[PDB]
Amino acid sequence: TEFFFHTMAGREGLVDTAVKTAETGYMQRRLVKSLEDLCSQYDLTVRSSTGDIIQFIYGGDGLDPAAMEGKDEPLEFKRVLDNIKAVFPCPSEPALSKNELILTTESIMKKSEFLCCQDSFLQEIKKFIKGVSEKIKKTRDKYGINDNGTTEPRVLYQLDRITPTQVEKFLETCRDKYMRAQMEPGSAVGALCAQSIGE
Amino acid sequence: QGRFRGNLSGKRVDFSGRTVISPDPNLRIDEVAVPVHVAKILTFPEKVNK
Amino acid sequence: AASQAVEEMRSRVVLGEFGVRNVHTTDFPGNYSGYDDAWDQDRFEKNFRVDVVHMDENSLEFDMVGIDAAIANAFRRILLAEVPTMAVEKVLVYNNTSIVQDEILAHRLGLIPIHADPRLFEYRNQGDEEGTEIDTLQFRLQVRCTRNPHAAKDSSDPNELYVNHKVYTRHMTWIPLGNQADLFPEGTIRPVHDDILIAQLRPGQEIDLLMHCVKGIGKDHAKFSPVATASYRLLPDITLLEPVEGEAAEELSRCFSPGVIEVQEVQGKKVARVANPRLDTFSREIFRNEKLKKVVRLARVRDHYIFSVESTGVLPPDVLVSEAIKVLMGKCRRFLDELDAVQ
Amino acid sequence: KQAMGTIGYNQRNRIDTLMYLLAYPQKPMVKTKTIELIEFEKLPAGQNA
Amino acid sequence: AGILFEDIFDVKDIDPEGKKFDRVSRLHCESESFKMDLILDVNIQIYPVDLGDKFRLVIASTLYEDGTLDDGEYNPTDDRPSRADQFEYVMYGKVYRIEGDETSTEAATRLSAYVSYGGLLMRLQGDANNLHGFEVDSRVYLLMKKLA
Amino acid sequence: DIVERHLIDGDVVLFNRQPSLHKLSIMAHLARVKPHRTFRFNECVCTPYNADFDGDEMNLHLPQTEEAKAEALVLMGTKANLVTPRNGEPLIAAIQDFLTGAYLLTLKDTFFDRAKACQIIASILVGKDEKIKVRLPPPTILKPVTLWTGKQIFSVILRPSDDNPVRANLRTKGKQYCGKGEDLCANDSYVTIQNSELMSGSMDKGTLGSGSKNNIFYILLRDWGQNEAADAMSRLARLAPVYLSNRGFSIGIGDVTPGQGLLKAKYELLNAGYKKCDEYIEALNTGKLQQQPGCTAEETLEALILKELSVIRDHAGSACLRELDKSNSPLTMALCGSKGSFINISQM
Amino acid sequence: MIIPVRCFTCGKIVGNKWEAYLGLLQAEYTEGDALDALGLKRYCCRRMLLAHVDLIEKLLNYAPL
Amino acid sequence: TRRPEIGDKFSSRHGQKGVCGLIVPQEDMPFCDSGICPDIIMNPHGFPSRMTVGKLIELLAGKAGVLDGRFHYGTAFGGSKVKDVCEDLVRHGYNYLGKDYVTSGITGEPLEAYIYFGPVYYQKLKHMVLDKMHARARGPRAVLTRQPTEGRSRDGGLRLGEMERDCLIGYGASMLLLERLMISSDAFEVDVCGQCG
Amino acid sequence: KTALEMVQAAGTDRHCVTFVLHEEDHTLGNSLRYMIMKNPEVEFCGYTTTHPSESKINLRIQTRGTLPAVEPFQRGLNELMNVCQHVLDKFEASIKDYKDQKA
RNA sequence: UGCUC
Ligand SMILES: Nc1nc2c(ncn2[C@@H]2O[C@H](COP(=O)(O)OP(=O)(O)OP(=O)(O)O)[C@@H](O)[C@H]2O)c(=O)[nH]1
Ligand SMILES: Nc1ncnc2c1ncn2[C@@H]1O[C@H](COP(=O)(O)OP(=O)(O)OP(=O)(O)O)C[C@H]1O
Ligand SMILES: [Mg+2]
Ligand SMILES: [Zn+2]
Ligand SMILES: [Zn+2]
């Protein structure tokens, strides 16, 4: 009886998959035949074949879903900061405090190459910088680390160690990733959407 | 099997083959092994240059 | 202590209940601090030895002590593949009416070993299908099955009704070429077993064919493999952590091979001891008894390999081992000559 | 249903558009009673390796 | 001398979570001179240990006592007077994390150095004054010698 | 003049599986001629094609135009399509016999001598890797015995040579991570890599598989380009098999047999469940049974019986997992996530 | 169809021990003791001789003759 | 007369259909203490997801049978139990679980884990690579629509179905799609009048 | 044309060398690996197979100091040849004395 | 129709 019930379940699954194959095949055919006309133009506006605009900007922001590092987000600031700290450790430079970190961030972000970047990404960068600066402040207040750089135990500076070089590297890497993660004009976005919804 | 679906949207082409696959981890991910028998049939037109 | 553990790791291979440990060769310079494992020809020649324990026709068993697993495996693989022998390669068929397929018949004939000495022949050059007197041998096989003129009325058994209905390999006749008849005496060139059943015929059917055999190595095709089973195993050495006596001694005797553990009455009570760890095959049946797990310690000697070579009968196994070592030396000499020519 | 093996004792005289035969077919070692009932051991379609 | 730290520890537990690994064990040890706790992965197959064992442990920047920090490459075949001659169990690792203690919400003075000897984890936790000289991305030598 | 040359090495060739669900079902690869009669490719690319090497026939097309060749190589390049456009997750990653191999390699029990370590490192020095230095990493334990851990051997794949600018960094959780160790888990399931050196954790499907983000190959692709990730994947595919074969990994009937305590627990659980089911049946048939909200009494009994059976199932599975000893091939393959899971083990 | 000459796994000559094996079946010997007397220690040759079916005579019964 | 090669499909009487991936020499195959080398090496990763314990039971029963010269029965809802075959294995001096001590043939060193050896009844299927291998040159075309034929027996070429066109569109390779569906398949040059169309 | 040498890069560094050997297999590769690994002047020694289809192997040798990594190769070859000669002589003597004592 | 996947 147990073997018969197991065979029943197996055949049920088999027929389910058999119906699913054809059903999803038809659905994919329809979705692709309907969405094969859209394309990303050079002015960041998704337009149909007749010239009508479907979206003034793809996804509201204009980022490539294939180049999405985070969960529906362009970058994971924590991972990028850790990678920058690990790849470029500067032992000959002192650590930065909250005020110094905020000052260098505001001075670097106001450059020309950062003007063309979207405002939301800059606001997210500012929020992450403020968060890490508050964390550094809390750490230094817990361990009484002085911003002057004359504390006797230097190992205390290794808890949250940040140098302006690492800050600049992090900002440049984030900007480059955000610029290279945008929708490249000419891509058949409609067909990609149809396939990603059909599969 | 109509003309739109059978002869315009999807149609048969030449210079193509169909064969069974087998594993081979000694090749790169961007590389594929082709048998000598099929390689001698599928030809590529190269233009004589300097 | 730590020294005992290091010694057990570098000398013994322990087999656990779930997995084997200390399986990698580590006796190399730089791996051990208190040991100078640098290569020394004197120590190798001193510690190395070979002792033959059994040697009969087409069967040899010998223990090599001092050699490493690498050279042991090299010798094994050379014997398996890189030892050349003679085997049927080309088959010329003349009106084969047998039910057995021509290709299947040629394949079966290719697997039949030949007693010819391969050292007296040479490899056939590329092509040259005609073959020369130096690098080929010819075997004619002509069998015509017919009804027995004198047989019983019923004669239900095929033996009485028909004659030559089973084409054994003894019907193969070696046809000398050139001066092979003078060099090889009569009876030397012949099938090894002389009893291999090639095919079965019926009256009216006839098998007439010629077989050209040339020299070849086992790597090209398995039909040239001289050794039927050439393998080696590490010498077991069973040790008892604590003296086991009583009916547990009989349990031990029943767990391992019947010929490795022996029970003796030294003071009227049965006590078990290792008699001959050679016969043990490490069935790992002692792990079933819960109490007798922590009383034994199965291990294999790293520098003691028992080689067992059972051949197909082309030539004795000692000459096979000699030719394997000679082929390895020839490869080494060829590579040395190539290197010298490079520089 | 697509296994390769012998068809019958008259497979040599039989001439079909497509036939597959095995050189050295061997009967299974773990054979079910149904195999003995259908006499499949007499016409095996595989080898024990 | 490149000795960054040196202290005698006593083991208080061998496997608090059970016998996970056959060759490696997670020893927990406490120091006598200071309140330095050590959670160290040790290879018991080659260097066996017990519960009541007391051993001297030294974390140094270089393996040579003369102060030569030329550690570009290590040649096991080279024989020369080194610090390892005075110890029994020598490992080579890198101090890959320095984390401040989070249990004390305020007025915290305890830190912890996590070192990875080829995967073997070693957390040395205690007062920051004893961890002087420890820096991230710094390769060091651990030397353990059992005492009577 | 035009010469119809044979298909030689270096020619871009389209390779596709007839049933296509997404665009990654067809990719442009580089053709290499081989004497056999089958299409062979790296198994790490099986997930996009969804192939299983069980008799599937795949199609191979040869473009007849230089422009088409260049477009196929650039847009449909295997190195340029390591991620799907659906959610950006990497599809071209490790697969069975590569996740288990890397897992067993990076286990804390692995300790290799100089000979075995050098052999495993040379196992990948083929092709373009023949013009680079080995860079043998220093040994971990050197005084008692010079032993190279398997994690260093695995990291050598990330940074084989000195001049290689690959500096991989990752910090994530494994499948069997407890949730409190924070890089000190008793199971050592917290993956931590710094400067292309495996500092902590064991590799599994969560880090080498094609499941989701946080994959080492994904980080390499997003940090150092496509070529570095492709080279790392090739090195892994060339190293893991050699070590897995030299070590030995097999499954037998003894790896799935139940223990005495397991049988006792199963018997007790079955007795308890049958007793509770009989009690519920008696309560419903004779008397008033507590009716669950949003359903009738019969559906309430159905739900209660299903709950009791699921309790029996999960308790038997937990008992079997607790009684099973380490080094068990099914348990290892379920832990590393290569193939199977705990449910299949409990069922079988 | 017919007993193979060589064993698949090892390669020991087993074709010459077929008819003799049949003789052991004509005698009172069982399968195990017969295979043991023939000198087949490893189980590969035991499987080769035991799992083999003799179909050559059944085909010869259909041969032209 | 065809010999098994790379691409030939093989079954093991348990639905574990597989294709020959590689043919390694005999010297490369691992060997046990008795010197037996395996003919077929299968992937164990197929057991957990498929739970084919029946294959392991069949292998153990076959090993016991070939050791004691018997034919065990795998009858459904019955047959020889595991205990009987384990007793038969331990009586003949072999392991009671099939796993045996094996030495690596390549490196010559013993394996850390025991290998599960035993006789399994493998059956070869009619699906061969030689019959399925296909390659199409220019070749002939159909009269109605000048395109390659369909079947291999008819010397037909492969079909770039609608899904292949969808994938090529998603990739954006316009020139590749044009060369496939226009240049290399049904290219032609017609004459159109610019006045009447 | 059987055994060919290759430098680690275009700089022609004699410290790291690669010997590509033709018509060989794991036998001689492993034998020479074991015989040359015992040379104290060898940092890294490793043999590999390019592809099972073609019959060729690639050995790689990196020494400690300024050794050309070619002299260790000849050293290992000569040591292997000497070991082969010694084991051959020992086996011949063993077989001879066994035949003598058997009769 | 049978199949293969
Ligand atoms: N043997 C065989 N039977 C077929 C074939 N095509 C169809 N049939 C059988 O005929 C029935 C369906 O007929 P169709 O396939 O519709 O025939 P059709 O396509 O209208 O015929 P044509 O237009 O001449 O191709 C099925 O029940 C099949 O068993 C074929 O190619 N071979
Ligand atoms: N009708 C079909 N349409 C599309 N693809 C198919 C069809 N039939 C088979 N395939 C191909 O075969 C694959 C189906 O295998 P899958 O269902 O995943 O395993 P399976 O056949 O259930 O094997 P198990 O029974 O799990 O051992 C996926 C698909 O590419
Ligand atoms: Mg499939
Ligand atoms: Zn055999
Ligand atoms: Zn007109």
Side-chain angles (χ1 to χ4, degrees), chain F residues 17 50-56, chain H residues 17:
Chain F
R17 189 155 182 271
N50 190 21
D52 36 351
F53 299 140
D54 56 336
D56 304 6
Chain H
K17 56 187 176 177

Coordinates of all heavy atoms in Angstrom, one line a residue, chain F residues 17 50-56, chain H residues 17, chain J residues 5, ligand 3:
Chain F
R17 N 21.0 24.3 -26.0 CA 20.1 23.2 -25.7 C 18.7 23.6 -26.3 O 18.2 24.7 -26.0 CB 20.0 22.9 -24.2 CG 19.2 21.7 -23.9 CD 19.7 21.1 -22.5 NE 19.0 19.9 -22.2 CZ 17.8 19.8 -21.6 NH1 17.2 20.9 -21.2 NH2 17.3 18.6 -21.3
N50 N 20.9 23.6 -18.1 CA 20.0 22.7 -17.3 C 20.2 21.3 -17.9 O 19.2 20.5 -18.0 CB 18.5 23.2 -17.4 CG 17.6 22.4 -16.5 OD1 18.1 21.8 -15.5 ND2 16.3 22.4 -16.8
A51 N 21.4 20.9 -18.2 CA 21.7 19.6 -18.7 C 22.1 18.7 -17.5 O 22.4 19.1 -16.4 CB 22.8 19.7 -19.7
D52 N 22.0 17.4 -17.8 CA 22.4 16.4 -16.8 C 23.2 15.2 -17.4 O 23.5 14.2 -16.6 CB 21.1 15.8 -16.2 CG 19.9 15.7 -17.1 OD1 20.1 16.2 -18.3 OD2 18.9 15.1 -16.8
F53 N 23.6 15.3 -18.6 CA 24.5 14.3 -19.2 C 23.8 12.9 -19.1 O 24.5 11.9 -18.8 CB 25.9 14.3 -18.6 CG 26.6 15.6 -18.8 CD1 27.3 16.1 -17.7 CD2 26.5 16.3 -19.9 CE1 28.0 17.3 -17.9 CE2 27.2 17.5 -20.1 CZ 28.0 18.0 -19.0
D54 N 22.5 12.8 -19.4 CA 21.8 11.5 -19.4 C 21.2 11.2 -20.8 O 20.1 10.7 -20.9 CB 20.7 11.6 -18.4 CG 19.7 12.8 -18.6 OD1 20.2 13.8 -19.2 OD2 18.6 12.7 -18.2
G55 N 22.0 11.6 -21.8 CA 21.5 11.3 -23.2 C 21.0 12.5 -23.9 O 20.4 12.4 -25.0
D56 N 21.1 13.7 -23.4 CA 20.6 14.9 -24.0 C 21.4 15.3 -25.2 O 22.6 15.3 -25.2 CB 20.6 16.1 -23.0 CG 19.8 15.7 -21.7 OD1 19.4 14.6 -21.6 OD2 19.6 16.6 -20.9
Chain H
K17 N 20.1 6.2 -15.5 CA 20.7 6.3 -16.8 C 21.9 7.2 -16.8 O 21.9 8.3 -16.2 CB 19.6 6.8 -17.8 CG 19.0 8.1 -17.4 CD 17.8 8.5 -18.3 CE 17.1 9.7 -17.8 NZ 16.0 10.1 -18.7
Chain J
rC5 P 15.7 10.1 -22.3 OP1 16.3 9.4 -21.1 OP2 14.3 10.2 -22.4 O5' 16.6 11.4 -22.0 C5' 17.4 12.0 -22.9 C4' 17.2 13.5 -22.9 O4' 16.1 13.7 -23.8 C3' 16.5 14.0 -21.7 O3' 17.6 14.0 -20.8 C2' 15.9 15.3 -22.2 O2' 16.7 16.3 -22.3 C1' 15.6 14.9 -23.6 N1 14.2 14.9 -24.0 C2 13.6 16.0 -24.5 O2 14.2 17.1 -24.6 N3 12.2 16.0 -24.7 C4 11.6 14.9 -24.5 N4 10.3 14.9 -24.8 C5 12.2 13.7 -24.0 C6 13.5 13.8 -23.7
Ligands
MG3 MG 18.6 15.1 -19.2

